[PDB]
C-alpha cells in the first residue's frame, strides 16, 4: 500500500517541450532510460521514503582490490542515496584491510568474508539479502561517485549503459558470439551493450539474474568455454532476453580519461579510478 503524495510546487511537465531532444529517453518496451534532465528527484525522493526504501550495495574487494575501498566508500557516503536506508555489502578475502568509513545516519556496513566470474555465485548471500533491503546495487569497488546517483535507479530490473559502446551500433558490441556459449548473440540481435559493473534491480529479480548468469558460466565451464567477457557476457545475454526496467545512461559508468567529457553527458557520477 502507498499512501498519498503531499502536496509539492514544482515546475509543470509540457508535454510539446521534451526534456531531452538528443538523446533516448524511453527504451522501445517502454523502460525509461535515465539521463540527467529526465527526473524530478523530489518527486522520487517522496515516493521511495514513503515506502522506506532500504538498498543494499555490493562490492568485491579481493586481492589487491581492499585498495579501493576507502575512496569508493567515502564518495558513496557523499552521493549515493543519501536520504535513504543503505545497507553496504563488502565481499573480501582480507577482512582487516577494510577501512574504518564514518557513515551517515540510517546508513550500516556489513564485512563478508570469502575466499580469493564468482561474484554472480556470491550473490546468489540469497536469504540474506531478502530479509534486510528492498534492492540491490552491485557495481565495481575500483570507481568513486562524483555526483548524485539516487533512487531514480531503482525498478525491478536495471542495466547500465557500459560507456564505450553507447553510440555503437550492434554488431560492434563484444558480445560472445561463438554458438557453443551460453552467452552467445548473434550479429543481428541485441538491444545494448550494458556494463557488468553496475546493475541491480529488486533483491527477487537481482536473485534471478545472478542465479540464470551463475548456472550458464558452470554449463560453460563444463563445455571448456569461457564468455569472452566473462559474467560481462552473461549478463548481457541475460538482459536480451529479460529486458531490464529502466537503462542507466553513461552518466552512471563513465571513464573520464579514457572518453573524456562530451557534452551529452550533464553529469558524471560514478566513475572509473585512473
Ligand atoms: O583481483 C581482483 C579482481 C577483480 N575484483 C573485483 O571485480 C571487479 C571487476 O574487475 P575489474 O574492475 O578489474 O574489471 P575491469 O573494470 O578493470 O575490466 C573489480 O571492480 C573488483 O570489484 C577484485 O576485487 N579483485
Ligand atoms: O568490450 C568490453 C570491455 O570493454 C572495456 O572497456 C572494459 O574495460 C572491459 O571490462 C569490458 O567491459
Ligand atoms: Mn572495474
Given at each position: 500500500?502507498?499512501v498519498?503524495?503531499?502536496?509539492?510546487?514544482?515546475?509543470?511537465?509540457?508535454?510539446?517541450?521534451?526534456c531531452?531532444?538528443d538523446?533516448?529517453?524511453?527504451?522501445?518496451?517502454?523502460?525509461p532510460?535515465?539521463?540527467?534532465?529526465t527526473?524530478?528527484?523530489?518527486?522520487?525522493?517522496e515516493?521511495?521514503?514513503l515506502?522506506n526504501?532500504?538498498?543494499?550495495?555490493?562490492?568485491?574487494?579481493?586481492?589487491?582490490?581492499?585498495?579501493?575501498?576507502?575512496?569508493?566508500?567515502?564518495?558513496?557516503?557523499?552521493?549515493?542515496?543519501?536520504?535513504?536506508?543503505?545497507?553496504?555489502?563488502?565481499?573480501?578475502?582480507?577482512?582487516?584491510?577494510?577501512?574504518?568509513?564514518?557513515?551517515?545516519?540510517?546508513?550500516?556496513?556489513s564485512?563478508?568474508?570469502?575466499?580469493?566470474?564468482?561474484?554472480?555465485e556470491?550473490?546468489?548471500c540469497?536469504?540474506?539479502?531478502?530479509?534486510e533491503?528492498?534492492?540491490?546495487?552491485?557495481?565495481?569497488?575500483?570507481?568513486?561517485?562524483?555526483?548524485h546517483?539516487?533512487?531514480?535507479?531503482?525498478?525491478?530490473?536495471?542495466?547500465?549503459?557500459?560507456?564505450?559502446?553507447?553510440?555503437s551500433?550492434?554488431?560492434?558490441?563484444?558480445?560472445?558470439?561463438?554458438?557453443?556459449?551460453?552467452?552467445?548473440?548473434?550479429?543481428?540481435?541485441?538491444?545494448?551493450?550494458?556494463?557488468?559493473?553496475?546493475f541491480?534491480?529488486?533483491?527477487?529479480?537481482?536473485?534471478?539474474?545472478?542465479?540464470?548468469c551463475?548456472?550458464?558460466?558452470?554449463?560453460?565451464?563444463?563445455?571448456?568455454?569461457?564468455?569472452?567477457?566473462?559474467?560481462?557476457?552473461?549478463?548481457?545475454?541475460?538482459?536480451?532476453?529479460?529486458?531490464?526496467?529502466?537503462?542507466?545512461?553513461?552518466?552512471?559508468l563513465?571513464?573520464?580519461?579514457?572518453?573524456?567529457?562530451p557534452?551529452?553527458?550533464?553529469?558524471?557520477?560514478?566513475?572509473?579510478?585512473?
Amino acid at each position: 500500500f502507498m499512501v498519498s503524495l503531499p502536496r509539492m510546487v514544482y515546475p509543470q511537465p509540457k508535454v510539446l517541450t521534451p526534456c531531452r531532444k538528443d538523446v533516448l529517453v524511453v527504451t522501445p518496451w517502454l523502460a525509461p532510460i535515465v539521463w540527467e534532465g529526465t527526473f524530478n528527484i523530489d518527486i522520487l525522493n517522496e515516493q521511495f521514503r514513503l515506502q522506506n526504501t532500504t538498498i543494499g550495495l555490493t562490492v568485491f574487494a579481493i586481492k589487491k582490490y581492499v585498495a579501493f575501498l576507502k575512496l569508493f566508500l567515502e564518495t558513496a557516503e557523499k552521493h549515493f542515496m543519501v536520504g535513504h536506508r543503505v545497507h553496504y555489502y563488502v565481499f573480501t578475502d582480507q577482512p582487516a584491510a577494510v577501512p574504518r568509513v564514518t557513515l551517515g545516519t540510517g546508513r550500516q556496513l556489513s564485512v563478508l568474508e570469502v575466499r580469493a566470474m564468482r561474484r554472480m555465485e556470491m550473490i546468489s548471500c540469497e536469504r540474506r539479502f531478502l530479509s534486510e533491503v528492498d534492492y540491490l546495487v552491485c557495481v565495481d569497488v575500483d570507481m568513486e561517485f562524483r555526483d548524485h546517483v539516487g533512487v531514480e535507479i531503482l525498478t525491478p530490473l536495471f542495466g547500465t549503459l557500459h560507456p564505450s559502446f553507447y553510440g555503437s551500433s550492434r554488431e560492434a558490441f563484444t558480445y560472445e558470439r561463438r554458438p557453443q556459449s551460453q552467452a552467445y548473440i548473434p550479429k543481428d540481435e541485441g538491444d545494448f551493450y550494458y556494463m557488468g559493473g553496475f546493475f541491480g534491480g529488486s533483491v527477487q529479480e537481482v536473485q534471478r539474474l545472478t542465479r540464470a548468469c551463475h548456472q550458464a558460466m558452470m554449463v560453460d565451464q563444463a563445455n571448456g568455454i569461457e564468455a569472452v567477457w566473462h559474467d560481462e557476457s552473461h549478463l548481457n545475454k541475460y538482459l536480451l532476453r529479460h529486458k531490464p526496467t529502466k537503462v542507466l545512461s553513461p552518466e552512471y559508468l563513465w571513464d573520464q580519461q579514457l572518453l573524456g567529457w562530451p557534452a551529452v553527458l550533464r553529469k558524471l557520477r560514478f566513475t572509473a579510478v585512473p
